[model samples]
Target chain A: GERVVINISGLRFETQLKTLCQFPETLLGDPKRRMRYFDPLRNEYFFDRNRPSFDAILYYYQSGGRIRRPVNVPIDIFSEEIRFYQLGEEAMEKFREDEGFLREEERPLPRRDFQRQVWLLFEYPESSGPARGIAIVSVLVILISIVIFCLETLPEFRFSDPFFVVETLCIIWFSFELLVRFFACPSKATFSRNIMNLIDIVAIIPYFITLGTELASLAILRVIRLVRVFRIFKLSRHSKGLQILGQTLKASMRELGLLIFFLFIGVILFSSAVYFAEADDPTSHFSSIPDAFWWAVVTMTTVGYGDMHPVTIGGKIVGSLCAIAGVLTIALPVPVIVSNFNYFYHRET
Target chain B: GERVVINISGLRFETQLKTLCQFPETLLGDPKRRMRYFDPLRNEYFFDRNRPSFDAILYYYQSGGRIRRPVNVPIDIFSEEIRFYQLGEEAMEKFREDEGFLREEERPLPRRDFQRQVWLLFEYPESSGPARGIAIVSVLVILISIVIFCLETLPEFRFSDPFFVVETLCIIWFSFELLVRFFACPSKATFSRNIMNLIDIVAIIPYFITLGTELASLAILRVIRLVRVFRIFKLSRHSKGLQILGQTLKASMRELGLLIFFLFIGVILFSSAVYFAEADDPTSHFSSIPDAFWWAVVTMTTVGYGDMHPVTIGGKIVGSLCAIAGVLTIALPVPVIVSNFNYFYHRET
Candidate 1:
């Protein structure tokens, strides 16, 4: 038998018989499947094809299905040739996996109108004009609360009078909105499971639960004050910047975890080493392994506070190496996280 | 007279005759070129072609030469199909341009034997075993100098005796290597033009040029001492981390510039605002707009040195906003540079 001659618009490629037989499901592999292009005069397969893609396609046959897309060829173009050649779904999926096409899972919607309408009102902004107004008002109230939160922290703005009136009104609106949402939610079990609503549930609880009562214990008031920090998470509902940051963090969580793990390893190594190395000197900064963790983290981040620095020669060497190692470790996963952040940020704009 | 029917495997695609005529260069556009696929029995152009790619190809005709590769189709496959359809080089190049094919310009090598062999020994580590040993020795010497460079800065390692002997030997080796490379004679005109060699030339100059010169003036000695920093740049020649960092910086120069530009803008605006805002308070930290740039940079980077901070209500508000804006500004170009560094870093490993 002669070679399997593949002629693409006059550019000829010849291959052996058994190569195509490896993947029998492919168009080239089956004898009857390729007979459509057989020219009897030339006694070869004379079909128009992409010359560069065909080179790789031929290699895919000969090399037992390592489909190397040509350097000059575009991905989309070569990918179609893969399909056209009838490379099985196994190869196609693997190829797509390697190519890294960003995918978003399709979300389900509520079946009927009433519950769906309320979900639409909360989940989507473009539902109705006044519906959008309600969303805007919610965002405005959240912003107002954040401003008061910051302003009241300063010595100038005394609490319990001017800012309190606005903040009290904000809590009233938040409680009203929460009641409306909780009632309209599909089910109580799933509603509690929903993280977004859970954040909202806690965000307004502290202020609403304690609008007029200061007759509690000192510890109780301290707990109420601490719960106010949950308001920051509530602001994430309408804040585009916060949403993108959260998404970027979620996507880059693996890389971020890897970074922290390495930092921990370095911190443990350096902290223990520094603790021992600086033991000889009288004026050393490091006291114990547990205490040196703070210094390790600060040095690794390159903040370099003068508050914690090595005094002795051995301690300084350990400190310098720790600083360098910390930076190197930090550098490993930084790009991946930053790259994820970039992707999320650009999607919003 | 009738619609153009393109039959791919069994799937049928029909379109107007004049649609593809927008590009007469293409196989679909030209009647003569498409006659190869035409079936007289079926009265259609029968192509056992890619089903998904054909849709985009049809769209390309309808979209007035707006060439598109289908979502499911790989770039190489669709590109080859583009060639198969004769979409012309214009469309292909534009497609490649948008797809952001990372192109590296091929580097040239020295011609002939003696000079080429010498260049190989210097430029490439894989030339010979002893040639690679030369490279390893060079890297070791560079590392040794860097250690001494850091060690000499400390209180313990005195410069005049023990460290000087090692540094002197390093200088001798560097000069010998430099002279051999310079004499290998690739022409002095282009020799200085090479950045790698220029770094090497200057790195050894400080110590080698002034080994025995004791009568040098105080300012002259200061100049020689300052030139020692050039040694850091030479270390970049063999240092993989440095090379990758340099390339990443080069690639992300635009984004880096953007980061700095935004920082400058924020600094200018906030520095001026802080200068005025703190004027009402007697105990304000901000003295002048110029002095506030340091505070602005430090605050924006989130380092928060605690040396300078705001006192007045207005100054505190200004400071908070400046801190928030700084982080936001930093977030912009961070991903791009990090992404580039990741690409370079991965390529090396």
Candidate 2:
């Protein structure tokens, strides 16, 4: 008997084995077997209708291309593409439509894409101190100034340890930040190649060490506060003049060394002088060379206040002179050096 | 020579040879002569007459092949070669050991090598600063901080006037430093190419112009304080982000300039608004637009304190908005615009 063996739902469906026949040797490219409707329709020898072997081919096969899956991408790369990379207007519009799913405020924020990575290494760009709508900028400036004012005035507030908590928090944040950066970029190629990461580690590690034990010392760790100011400065590095200044200082390292030597001498003279002037005064605060050194600094910088005073006209005169000298001394060499770099080398370059 | 040269009894026989040649030239060949020796046996030089020079040569040399002697070659050729070249180490080391000399820590520090030059130019090598212990680091850190705190807090302590004495001292010091620098690098090439020198002249010359005469106040000269801060910033440039920030800001001057444009608008808005709001009140801080400009600055920057206030809710709202706008406005275009050269050209490159 001539009979055709077919694959129904990917399994062999023998068409009623009308007569004995060997299993078909040639595959008819996996025969499609189906009925227009319920084909009253089961041929006796047909494969079980809906049930098929897991590996069997089907008449109307579901394909691998039907559904899409998401991929995991590094946060920085993803955010850079989203935040910085330009796309076709059509694509952007499509994205914008999808962006509606995010809140208006959150839509513009890049935090969702790279928030964890950024926060781990730096301040959260989104977590700025609260301010009203467009008023955020002016609010921060005023706030900073006011805080400076408060710090300057109201001695009682001083005992309240104004910066203690903030400093401690900054130290903690920076410590963890450095650790995360290290762990996150542990590969030697990535770690060694990055100056910013290295700087973050070096500048911050001391504070962590200090926090861990008495050996780290408050005096040494206090430098970190000044360092933190530079983080803000880091935002300025892309400028030409700053690069000029940086390169010039580097070129003139020896002269800069000499300048530092003189500055050191000035520090000592002013510190000792202020110490002598204010130490015996009835109203003197921190009555030692170290204490007066602070006053000397303030006076020399011409950032004078009435908090500490020299009762004698002599001390007052000394204070004033120190202030004036401080200004002149600092200005004397650097501008010449830096501007020369700017005017000559920077120009030439 | 036949008369035994009638040399002074106590004088080194090598002294005669040195007179015939140069100090370094006579020391060659012996290798050991490079080393400075104590000559504990009371400076006797009669035996063989070559030992003193040999000892000096040996200490200075490290190693090389067998050293040559003037006796082995024509004196003129030897003299020419001696002046033209320096000895290698291996031969010299062997010569020194033959002379029974010991090394000491007091040896002259080696001249800086190329690696040092390169490092100093672009990065800090710890070897440059005192690296013996942490003491100097601790002391400098404390000293600088104490100075900074004082400078930060100085305005409270003294009259802004009559500190002309130290200002004079600063002028004199700068003058001396300039004179020294001029002598140290006497090449007139600086006259043609060195803008830094010109800058130096401008900065230091101003000090000299006002010296002792007191014709002008030190207010203009006070910008020198910035140098002090820059100097401090330099100390940490080795491991600090401040240098990087300084570079960034210098590069971003254009963008910062763009941001500042808005700040100017803010300034004007604040000035006019506050002036109109508070001009008529007896307790009003604003007498004119200019007077109110300070308030405007303070308010616009969000430095609001009760020191200056607007009683009217409208004025307060405007002030508050300005304060809030301060933070947002400055930062608004920053993310959108501020970036490095690499970023600007990154799309094509």
Using TM-score as the measure, the top candidate is 1
Model 1 chain B poorest 10 in a row by lDDT: B150-159
User: What are the per-model DockQ values?
Assistant: 0.04, 0.01
Give lDDT tens digits, candidate 2, residues A1-349: 2223343344443322221112222122222322222233443233433332211111111121111111233333433343321223433344445333222233222235454444333333345433132134323433443354346446775325556454555555556645654544425464577545555555455555656676434665466545534443222222346556666766767546544554664666666555555544576564554456556555544454545544454464555446434543443344446555856453435
Per-residue alpha-carbon lDDT of model 1 for A10-64, expressed as tens digits? Answer: 7665554665678888888788998988999988787776766776666566545
Give the DockQ-based CAPRI class for model 1.
incorrect
Considering the two chains of model 2, state its CAPRI-style docking category. incorrect
Model 1 whole-model lDDT (C-alpha atoms): 0.72
Score every model by TM-score: 0.48, 0.29
**Global Cα lDDT for candidate 2:** 0.43
Q: Relative to the unseen true structure, what is the Cα RMSD of model 1?
A: 17.2
- Candidate 2 chain A lDDT trough over 10 residues, lowest sum: A59-68
> TM-score (0 to 1) of chain B, per candidate?
0.68, 0.41
